[PDB]
Write an enzyme that holds these catalytic residues in place. Sequence first.
Site, PDB file in Angstrom:
ATOM      1  N   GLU A  46       0.813  -1.214   0.000  1.00 56.42           N
ATOM      2  CA  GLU A  46       0.000   0.000   0.000  1.00 56.42           C
ATOM      3  C   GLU A  46       0.849   1.267   0.000  1.00 56.42           C
ATOM      4  OE1 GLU A  46      -2.646  -0.262   3.393  1.00 56.42           O
ATOM      5  OE2 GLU A  46      -4.173  -1.342   2.220  1.00 56.42           O
ATOM      6  N   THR A  47       0.446   2.233  -0.823  1.00 58.94           N
ATOM      7  CA  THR A  47       0.961   3.599  -0.820  1.00 58.94           C
ATOM      8  C   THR A  47      -0.179   4.574  -0.547  1.00 58.94           C
ATOM      9  OG1 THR A  47       2.795   3.180  -2.378  1.00 58.94           O
ATOM     10  CG2 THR A  47       2.103   5.404  -2.191  1.00 58.94           C
TER      11      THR A  47
END
Lengths: 293, 307
Positions: A46-47
């Site tokens: 995840e970003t």
Amino acid sequence: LKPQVYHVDAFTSQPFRGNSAGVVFPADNLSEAQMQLIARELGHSETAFLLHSDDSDVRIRYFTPTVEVPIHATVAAHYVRAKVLGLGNCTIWQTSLKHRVTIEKHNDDYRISLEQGTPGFEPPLEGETRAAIINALHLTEDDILPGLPIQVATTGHSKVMIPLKPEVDIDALSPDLNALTAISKKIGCNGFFPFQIRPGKNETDGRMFSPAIGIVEDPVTGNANGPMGAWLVHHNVLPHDGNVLRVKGHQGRALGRDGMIEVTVTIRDNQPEKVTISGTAVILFHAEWAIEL
Amino acid sequence: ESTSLYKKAGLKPQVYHVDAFTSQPFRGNSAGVVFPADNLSEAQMQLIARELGHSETAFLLHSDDSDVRIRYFTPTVEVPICGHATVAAHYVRAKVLGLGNCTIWQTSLAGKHRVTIEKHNDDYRISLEQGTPGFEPPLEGETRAAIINALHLTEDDILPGLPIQVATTGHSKVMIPLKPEVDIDALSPDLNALTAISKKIGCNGFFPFQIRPGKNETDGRMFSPAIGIVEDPVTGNANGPMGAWLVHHNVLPHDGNVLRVKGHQGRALGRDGMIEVTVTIRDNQPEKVTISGTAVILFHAEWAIEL
């Protein structure tokens, strides 16, 4: 002021441990396609992309390398935001596709607390379904904590609670991933959370397997540990004062990605009313993008 | 006359995030570069490579017997040398040190390699010499049919008069020459069948490609499911042998001395890249294969932690 990228390990103080996430800030002038491209490029599970809100302090969008997802990158984003803005001991409200966040500062470092959704439980998995889950981890009935169910619990993103005896070598588990995936389709949950309780302590060690969605093992999972805390109250498994139960959840040891989540459960009539999770993080590095946009 | 390494590159390790074999951000083949990397232990390098998550991260070290020493790590293990990471590495070093046109030497687990650097208008192109060209006997019969069937093509899609054949300059790949009419981007191979074929023939990578009509240029895709990488964006180890194979089968016109081919790869992946393959020719056979590429630095910084 210029787009920056932060590489962060969440739920840990130790570099190279915890659950790594990207944080991009500010992200105000990026399209959905540009955010998806950056998330793919950085390659974290995840970003987070932090933007301006007209009815809150912060809007955040989360992307995996392939698709957008919902509200560990949350802890990362708010840790980064606290460090960059010089935030104090305060309350913050998040909007994303209204979530209460608390920030605490001790010793020029930060702890981030997220209030999760309503605790809930699905009926216990019994008989052949129970035996299928036990067999998929290569365990037996004797490995399960006596008198307690295997059962889906949730505070917003449901997980299968699998309570193990402390004698079980949780790090040696190597699940039949195809079997877990087949069970996921029958029970409507993609994440399995074997955990055990450290003797005499309000502390646990767990692992989160989710092969149905392409993540074999997540290092440190807020959406598993939160419901585990609620579940422990609901089945009156740990002694408490009837008001608050605090559990220190550990996860990620077998991956070499040890992390820690503090789970705080509010209690009314011996049932879990509200669950908060908290953790710290460490920024490994940050940089201005050397390219246009 | 000193490169002034620590003045120009700084005294503390920096991480660079680089896309190789392209000038476009978010395209080509990504690699990490850590420069300078002196005094980092092996354990630290392996942890950093795991952390960055590229197929390879390269660590640039001072050398006593060459211009630069490079160690290469995947997320799980050290490896001898890597093409696209070698391009990323030298691109970073050339740009950080302000190098001009030169020929330098690098040292690695794979030995001493010559590297050429070209500067044109503040940009850089890196050239690497590959290993000895060779070929195995063409795949015919069941094996040719099963490779074709596994790509969901027919015999009609293969370039007439040309074999499906393992070619190598060090790391072997199956050359599968396709007609220009084939929609290479729509290929969706039966990956289990490819893996089985890899076990049988002793080759872990398949390289269907086609030639752009009237040009010394190609489009390819490299499938290698037998070693856990379904499709690689831009593969020096496929394009180099392709160039040699084109000379060996006299497929493209040349002056009897050099064949230059612009290889393209990775479009279907959304990771378009380009490798220039130069094949030195002697008596219409490939003697020597060189690949060249550029790169783009997305960002770089010192670490915020003490290493």
